[PDB]
Design a protein around this ligand. Structure first.
Ligand SMILES: Nc1ncnc2c1ncn2[C@@H]1O[C@H](COP(=O)(O)OP(=O)(O)O)[C@@H](O)[C@H]1O
Lengths: 464, 593, 63, 49, 592, 226
């Protein structure tokens, strides 16, 4: 049957090089290497006995530029033995990961045994064949109305959460993680904490246990105190575990990659060590491809029932969309859930600002039997009236409420009862998509049918 | 055969390689990864590899193929999806039995097994045949029927043996040319270097409009068949949707969609949606997918392959122009090509230009956009093809000051600049009418005079209305609407109506997926007539405050004219618009009486 | 005098609110953007000079 | 949200001076509105009397 | 031993150093100048010399040390001044007899001539001992008596000989360990790599508040032990008041004050003010210096020392946490440390990140702050210490847009936002209640609901009333103040009363200074009960002006409740408030 | 600074080191930093200019064992009058004050052209006191600064709301600003004013306002003086 595993049932010796010809920053430059392999995980053995992993990055003939994940602090030329494993970094995956807590590099930290591998998969992964991809048309009844009815989430959606430093992205991402469920029929979850503080790590690791998800969530916790470069391989490890689960055991995985800005900062702090092309704002030029290698490991594939949803939480610095991390994340991903600092200050939970929020899989998974026929038109009409209300609120703050027209006053009323009665929601209150659409229609009934310039006449007649 | 000597991402400096030419194609590594040479320093020739370089080892043999990056042209191009390099994704998947692109797959570019109904052209044995002459047409599909088999542009001489009509595979010889005593055998397919543009007899001024089917585009910023186009805009502005709604419903005969650094699910959406749509052209309801080929090099697929995907797409479009088809190549995320160039230059260590990009980015983009343009094909019979390039430049951070955007605006004749602010409000396609322009408006007078004579007059009138109301709204936002006159208030209301019911075109909707030229012209006439008659009524002495309540019915009928489904036929929708105009005139007459 | 003074007060308060909520936010955003662009230009010039320095040092070592 | 001014050191200085001028004008016009509204209250009292 | 090969400014390239690791301190030159190995290349090793590098002739011997930048942890580091590189400033002054710091001075970080009273712990010979296990205690002062003697965290084995109770000096073998052969021969002190966080068994949740003593900081924007805060640290904003309050009133049993790059005369002020600070401990008035160490570091000091100042301070605080003592590390102008980091990056040629700072600024800041937190100390016996960081942010150019300020505000959970205008208005402690925030309020429920249950609801009520007061002030600026309703007027008056007699605290008065948690809670109860009684009276239909005129006595009592001396004890203070609160309820009711 | 260190610590005497054109010194640092291969920093000036200026500035201040003291007054040239320039920014970070010479005042012809609104000294409170200078100094300087700010605001306000509509305080403050910039800040190039004489002139200026209008002055100071 499974003859593939037997082919790897062999022994291969490894070369131990005590030939470190220098080291500078996080880069260890070897010499006299016997046929170096580009991107081969390498186990360094420090003089003190500490074993630091590292992967080759440049293999100029008979020389290897090994970058170490844990940092070069303590590496000696005449004492370190650098041992070449002869194969790229691989995580030992199995169906037994689900329910375990791993470190940044995949070494379990739950006082449990090493993963009884069913197979070893290269963490970099491979680009899924675009002919084998399936467009995700199965919408997820997320539970939060601001997402379910506007900026809708499909199954293979890769929709990040954009949030400022202090906004409750974790609370929202936990609510989506705990209430997500297919609208017209659970999610295995894979987590990857990159640079989160211990408070956030414990919040997630406790919310999963509280909701019972921890029986089917594998956590890759790379906290702030973990090595900075390990955050490069943490999301690749998480997505390789998720790819195994989904596309091989046919599970529906909801991958969460918290603090993707920390991963981007790790990319910048590694590129600046190699003096690479500085792109924009100091982030490397190839950071588009580096983030794409992460995000594109999502979506359903043909012939396999599995699917990987992604919700990479992102912390926008200074709450600026134009920053390279949110900008390239918006270009690569298929949506965004913009958590708004202004809304959070106003006190609304969830502080989702639907105007910058987007979902590119909402033109599908809407209408007919997937959801009520009014969804597609109602979401657009809500967007239009919300924007009109925002513009009229600015005009009011400038000139005064006396100059607001009848339409502007209606927009103000709609905006108020929208932010304070449609975006707002209990932390543990889940709203079905039909109930959210009914509330949206209740809001829309402020306007007469004439002012609703976006709803089709048939939809207006049937539902207004 | 040389040997690898250094690997640093997508660059492989290969030693012991005396004899490799610039931009030659090499097979780097044991898996025979496809790579091209870009720099030569003695023996060591620096190779960029169009495949994942991870796992390469120093000493891995690299084979010099002896030919630049060549795309195979011929039958079977249509209705298929390709990777950056010319590899069929379907064939790759069925060969690998997996869902991943394996490293080093060498599937033939065009399906050899499928047999095509070759029918010889006018050329007979002994007649001199020059480059680009048509010596037969193969029945590709029901839509691209008579896929006329051109001779290679560089080939010349006299026919010695031409195959009779029948069924032939690509490997089967179809014609043998004798030239100076050296006979050369030609088949249904011929390779072509992607970097080298395909020759044409003479380019021509592009005087026919590429009807995008979207009201804002083909009514304010037209694109002609053969004109370079650019669509800058931040993420979510709608460049991809404009490109898809152009490749779904344009008047182009064949379409070469290029997803250079796009999303995988976008290409999957195209693959599942194009077979479900049918083009009314060719006198039948043939599917769209029978006329579109796709070059899918998604964002995470090898960085170097993005350039190969762009060049392969434009070469396919050039071939289908030489056949005589109005091609419309669409380079999705053309800025990802610039980013791939930046990444490769950073690997090479070359000195950067503005913002990390190499110094030759402008030259490469200019030479790429100059491939477009209507041109008479190379050989007999006389053929007039056209390639229209609609490339979506993706600015970094949403600012049009990006070097790729500037180097694209310097060459493209059209600029469909998208606005993120209008995109957020779902005001779609979010074309920024303030900055967008089309240099083909003057050229299209010769077509708008023949059909829809009042179209340019309406276009300048609506641009005037939009500009005047934009300036007035800018003033009002800081000085209040108190000082506006009745005419200014009418301009504000009319332009708000235009933006919210004419310029906005809700794609993925039954009624407004494709608003053709005749329905666009009629809606444009209705809006302009509403503005003009409202201004005449206010000049006659009627107060605008009362007139708004009196003519809300007419205003809502005008705003609801976009709901007239174009599938009802040109005669039916034109009749409905004539009735609406009559009702509008009667309502204003009654109100002003 | 009451009517004239009320009109002038409305105009002045309108201008004050406009300055506070449009001109100052717009100008502050423009300052931030211009400073960010200048910083990006300085970073690009730094990278170009760093590449020149690396080439010079490599040439000196090769000598 | 931002002007289309081309980013340059001279442009940055000009726009910083413009911000300083706008802030000074804001303070001046706020104080003028305060003085004129005190006078407006006085005028309203005299109107009632 | 190595040898100099090239000197070019601070960076020194030394030949014949096969076997040196990075970040290992090497004694450069004949004067034994200290420098860290930046990078290696074959036999060479680029060294960043800390002190001034003028006068290093090539061929000068360079001695390896074999350890990274290390801080010498042990008895005797209390009540003494250090620089960033852990050089005792008092000892340097005494030894050199010169008001300067002599170049390359190497006075040991701990006084080896002092004799300590060592009393061995429960561990005896033949008992297995692991890193962090306490095997003794040293009476170091009167405030920090029982200064434990930990085993070095990376050392493990079995005891072969333990010294008996008696008087010992440092560098004297106090305990010997045998582990897989060989011997350890430990002393009363051990050196720890500064950049490596000290290990702990488990990092607990910070569920206990760090009582600064100020009413506003201990009520509205609380700090938990093991929590990280931020302070604007503007010129004259009150950062001195906040630091002194923490140092002499906080629950922390040890204080670390790091001066990572502040001005020289500001450091002189700090070094002449802390010895004059006296903290009334359990016994009597005792100097705050016996519980506080100072990493005083003027901008004249070496840039490497400035960049390592916060690391040294946090490592000392970590060591004291491993002894079970709650610590409160105070960082002065962390943006100066960021500027030192930027200077070092500029020396190294590393490419700039946002606004010229190094690429790893956010990573270094996060990894530094993650050391702060209540953690159960490593080894036996079990003991739960804590390190809480109060880092002044000192924005560059007076703007909060700097990357260091942005990263610090994103990492720290508390931001006591001192305001220059509030400081100028003579409203000490100049805490701007409209910008300050503390994200530890949710966590502090587990303590409030156990000790003072109503306290979170009271705090939320005052935050709401202060926001409503800001809105009312905006309204009264827009139009006439008389246009406000009776309820709005009552809210505005109560909020002014709060801002004048609850938030505004005098740091010199005996009664006002160091308001305890119980007094703060009782005063909050009194204030909000007065506001609620006024609101109820207004709802009853009584005129606001008449009610205020009648209840002026209750208002005066509420305002003077600030003066209730906490020295009388919690029982007496609570009884006084009950009588004071009862009168307010009675007077505000019958007056209608 | 070495001469200052000698004369002020090895010898027991005070020193007032005055350093001219720290902008020229920074240009010199730039020349040497780029005389090596070092890459230019934030604005061409080296990235270590903070340390290179701290090592110059900080070699001053009173010392415990010595009766001498070095006080530095680094004269500094602001290019384009931009405070955010690296030299003024780093000097503001390292030093303990800021004296501004105003282009507007100099054009008006006010020698010396110090504008006191931006200028400040952090360690003024340690100098002005009962034993050092007159006991009124602390209140007099604060009142003078407050009244000068009020006068500047009133001068701005006159051109927009008319001279006659200003309050009594602003009307007096206009005359105070005129008689201040024309008599107090204005000072001959060879006119030496002792601190006591300068305070006497300050009081003669402050006598313009009524005794109840000097809000910042302490009541005891008002009683003794005025
Ligand atoms: N003309 C349109 N009609 C309807 N929806 C549109 C239109 N243009 C864009 N969209 C919406 O925008 C999203 C895709 O935007 P896209 O073109 O991918 O922008 P980008 O290429 O910048 O990612 C889809 O969810 C779709 O709903």
């Amino acid at each position: 049957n499974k003859k593939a595993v037997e082919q790897g049932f062999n022994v291969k010796p490894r070369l131990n090089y005590n030939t470190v010809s220098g080291v500078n920053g996080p880069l260890v430059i070897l010499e006299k290497v016997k046929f170096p392999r580009y991107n081969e995980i390498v186990n360094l053995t420090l003089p003190d006995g500490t074993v630091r992993q590292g992967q080759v990055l440049e293999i100029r003939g008979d020389r290897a530029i090994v970058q170490v994940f844990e940092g070069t602090s303590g590496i000696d030329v005449k004492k370190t033995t650098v041992e070449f494993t002869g194969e790229s970094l691989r995580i030992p995956v199995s169906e037994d990961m689900l329910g375990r807590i791993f470190d940044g590099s995949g070494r379990p930290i739950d006082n449990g045994p090493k993963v009884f591998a069913e197979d070893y998969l290269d963490i970099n992964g491979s680009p899924i064949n675009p002919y084998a991809r399936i467009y995700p048309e199965e919408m997820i009844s997320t539970g939060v109305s601001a997402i379910d009815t506007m900026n809708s989430i499909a199954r293979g959606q890769k929709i990040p959460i954009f949030s400022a430093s202090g906004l409750p992205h974790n609370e929202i991402a936990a609510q989506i993680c705990r209430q997500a469920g297919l609208v017209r029929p659970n999610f295995s979850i894979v987590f990857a904490a990159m640079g989160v503080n211990l408070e956030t790590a414990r919040f997630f690791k406790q919310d999963f246990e509280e909701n019972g998800s921890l029986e089917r969530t594998s956590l890759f916790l790379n906290l702030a105190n973990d090595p900075t470069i390990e955050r490069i391989i943490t999301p690749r490890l998480a997505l390789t575990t998720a790819e195994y689960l989904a596309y091989q055991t046919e599970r529906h995985v909801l991958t969460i990659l918290t603090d993707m800005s920390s991963y981007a900062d790790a990319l910048r702090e590694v590129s600046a060590a190699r003096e690479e092309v500085p792109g924009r704002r100091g982030y490397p030029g190839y950071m588009y491809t580096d983030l794409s290698t992460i995000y594109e490991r999502a979506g359903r594939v043909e012939g396999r029932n599995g699917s990987i949803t992604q919700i990479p939480i992102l912390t926008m610095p200074n709450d600026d969309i134009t920053h390279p991390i949110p900008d390239l994340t918006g270009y690569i991903t298929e949506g965004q859930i913009f958590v708004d600092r202004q809304l959070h200050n106003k006190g609304i939970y969830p502080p989702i600002n639907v105007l910058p929020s987007l979902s590119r899989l909402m033109k599908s998974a809407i209408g007919e039997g997937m959801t009520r026929k009014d969804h597609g038109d109602v979401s657009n009409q809500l967007y239009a009236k919300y924007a009109i209300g925002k513009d009229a609120a600015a005009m009011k703050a400038v000139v005064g409420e006396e100059a607001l027209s009848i339409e502007d006053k209606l927009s103000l009323e709609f905006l108020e009862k929208f932010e304070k009665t449609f975006i707002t929601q209990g932390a543990y209150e889940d709203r079905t998509v039909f109930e959210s659409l009914d509330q949206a229609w209740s809001l829309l009934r402020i306007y007469p049918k004439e002012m609703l310039n976006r709803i089709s006449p048939k939809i207006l007649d049937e539902f207004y | 055969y040389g040997a690898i000597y250094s690997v640093s991402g997508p660059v492989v400096i290969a030693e012991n390689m005396i004899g490799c030419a610039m931009y030659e194609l090499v097979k780097v590594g044991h898996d025979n990864l496809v790579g091209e040479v870009i720099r030569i320093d003695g023996d060591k020739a620096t190779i960029q590899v169009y495949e994942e370089t991870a796992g390469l080892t120093v000493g891995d043999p690299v084979l010099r193929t002896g030919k630049p990056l060549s795309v195979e042209l011929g039958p079977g191009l249509m209705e298929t999806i390709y990777d950056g390099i010319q590899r069929p994704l379907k064939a790759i998947k069925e060969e690998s039995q997996s869902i991943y692109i394996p490293r080093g797959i060498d599937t033939p570019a065009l399906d050899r097994t499928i047999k095509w109904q070759f029918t010889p052209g006018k050329f007979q044995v002994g007649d001199h045949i020059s480059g680009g002459d048509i010596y037969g047409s193969v029945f590709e599909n029901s839509l691209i029927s008579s896929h006329k088999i051109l001779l290679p542009p560089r080939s010349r001489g006299t026919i010695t043996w031409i195959a009779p009509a029948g069924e032939y595979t690509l490997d089967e010889k179809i014609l043998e040319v004798e030239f100076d005593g050296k006979k050369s055998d030609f088949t249904l397919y011929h390779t072509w270097p992607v970097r080298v543009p395909r020759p044409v007899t003479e380019k021509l001024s592009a005087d026919y409009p590429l009807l995008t089917g979207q009201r804002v585009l083909d009514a304010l910023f037209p694109c002609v068949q053969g004109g370079t186009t650019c669509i800058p805009g931040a993420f979510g502005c709608g460049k991809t949707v404009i490109s898809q709604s152009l490749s779904k419903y344009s008047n182009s005969d064949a379409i070469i969609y290029v997803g250079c650094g796009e999303r995988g699910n976008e290409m999957a959406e195209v693959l599942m949606e194009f077979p479900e749509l049918y083009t009314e052209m060719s006198g039948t309801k043939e599917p769209i997918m029978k006329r579109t080929t796709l070059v899918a090099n998604t964002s995470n697929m090898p960085v170097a392959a993005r350039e190969a995907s762009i060049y392969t797409g434009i070469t396919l479009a050039e071939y289908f122009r030489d056949q005589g088809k109005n091609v419309s190549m669409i380079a999705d995320s053309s800025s990802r090509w610039a980013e791939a160039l930046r990444e490769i230059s950073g690997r090479l260590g070359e000195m950067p230009a503005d913002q990390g990009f190499p110094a030759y980015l402008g030259a490469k983009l200019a030479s790429f956009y100059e491939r477009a343009g209507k041109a008479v094909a190379l050989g007999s019979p006389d053929r007039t093809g056209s390639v229209s390039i609609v490339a979506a430049v993706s600015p970094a951070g949403g600012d049009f000051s990006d070097p790729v955007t500037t180097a694209t605006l310097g060459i493209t004749q059209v600029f469909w600049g998208l606005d993120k602010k209008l995109a957020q409000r779902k005001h779609f396609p979010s074309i920024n009418t303030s900055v967008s322009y089309s240099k083909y408006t003057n050229v299209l007078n010769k077509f708008y005079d023949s059909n829809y004579p009042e179209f340019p007059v309406l276009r300048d009138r609506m641009k005037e209305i939009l500009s005047n109301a934009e300036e007035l709204e800018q003033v009002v936002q800081l000085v209040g609407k108190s000082a506006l006159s009745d005419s200014d208030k009418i301009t504000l209301d009319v332009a708000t109506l235009i933006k919210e019911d004419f310029l906005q075109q809700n794609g993925y909707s039954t009624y407004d997926a494709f608003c053709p030229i005749w329905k666009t012209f009629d809606m444009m006439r209705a809006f302009i007539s509403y503005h003009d008659e409202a201004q005449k009524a206010v000049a006659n002495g009627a107060n605008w405050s009362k007139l708004a309540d009196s003519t809300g019915d007419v205003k809502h009928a005008v705003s609801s004219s976009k709901f007239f489904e174009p599938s009802r036929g040109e005669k039916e929708v034109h009749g409905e618009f004539e009735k609406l105009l009559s009702t509008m005139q009667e309502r204003f007459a009654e109100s002003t009486d | 005098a009451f009517i004239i003074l009320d009109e002038v007060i409305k105009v002045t308060n309108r201008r004050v609110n406009a300055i506070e909520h449009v001109i100052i936010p717009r100008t502050e955003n423009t300052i931030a953007y211009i400073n960010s662009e200048l910083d990006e230009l300085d970073r690009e010039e730094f990278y170009r000079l760093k590449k020149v320095q690396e080439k010079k040092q490599n040439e000196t070592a090769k000598l | 949200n931002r002007e289309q001014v081309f980013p340059t050191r001279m442009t940055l200085g000009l726009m910083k001076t413009k911000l300083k001028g706008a802030n000074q004008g804001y303070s001046l016009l706020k104080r003028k509105s305060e003085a004129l509204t005190k006078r407006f209250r006085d005028i309203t009292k005299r109107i009632d009397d």
